[PDB]
Amino acid sequence: LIQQCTAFLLDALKNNRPSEGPLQTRLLEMNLMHAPQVADAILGNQMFTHYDRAHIAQLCEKAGLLQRALEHFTDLYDIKRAVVHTHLLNPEWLVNYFGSLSVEDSLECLRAMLSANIRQNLQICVQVASKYHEQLSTQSLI
Amino acid sequence: DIKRAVVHTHLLNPEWLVNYFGSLSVEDSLECLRAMLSANIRQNLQICVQVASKYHEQLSTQSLIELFESFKSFEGLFYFLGSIVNFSQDPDVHFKYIQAACKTGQIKEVERICRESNCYDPERVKNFLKEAKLTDQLPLIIVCDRFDFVHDLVLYLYRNNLQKYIEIYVQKVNPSRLPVVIGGLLDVDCSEDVIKNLILVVRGQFSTDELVAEVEKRNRLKLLLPWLEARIHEGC
């Protein structure tokens, strides 16, 4: 029972003393193959602090976990690939907005996403512009 | 004949259509949907994809897939193979599938299946790549070295251009093949200071042995000495 022994290890992880990054790292790695829903609570509790965010991001990449892969870009700031992957399809709605918002490199991000701006991200760029212009409605925008 | 209500397919109920498809489709309705595509509005288009995924499921005839690819069909055959790519191992149809992903970019969803589906001929497809230039490709920088044909590949690339794909490759994908890559670069007599600067970039799987091998096979090790200084100064 990998599931239940992993759960018991998780119960141990509730205390920071048994909370040892690599152990719970492997636990979450198995979860990514089995159940990603728990990864939300894990990210709340200890994930970003204890885990190898790079390896886990690569895992969620290969596993098609784009939404928590956004949490990973938030963990990793993977500039070109975060840009292109967001450019792919419908992301975590406001999470992507702020992640883009929470950087001054959203400039070049939008340059990229606009170089290939298919009609999907067509309006949303102007929409999120109504999240940066509000601090800097620069002629850079025009 | 029965191939007359194909006009009302613009409005007609596909349920009793599939019912009439239970019969009349034993190598028969193929020509009916064929004529429908001879008048292929978008209405008699998606339903034809659906009925293609109604007979291949009962008879995955290669004649069907051939008459299918006879047209553009790239998205139609895309979904069609998406119903078949699993548990099917024909190299040609898989290459057609990847090329369809190239038609409208569905590579991110295929470059992973190129890793998954390795039941094909990477030589032909990599020749196609060297012919069909995507100008932003990253399926061969994954799957060709997954099959390890990248020596003469990166040779040809250096011949045309090699700026960052080398870099992102050795960074995320694989710094373990980095040695033979460097060796090829030495065979083509590149600018070695570039390789040096890459070594200065944080390395993944990388060690002293392969590095000194690379620097000795050209007997021009006058480059890695600051790397060794850093190694020993840090205590390694």
From TrEMBL, chain A:
Domain of life: Eukaryota
Subcellular location(s) per record: Cytoplasmic vesicle membrane; Membrane, Coated pit
Start and stop residues of the CHCR repeats: 1-126
Function: Clathrin is the major protein of the polyhedral coat of coated pits and vesicles.
Family according to the record: Belongs to the clathrin heavy chain family.
Protein name, UniProt field: Clathrin heavy chain
Full protein: residues contained: 558 to 699 of 1675
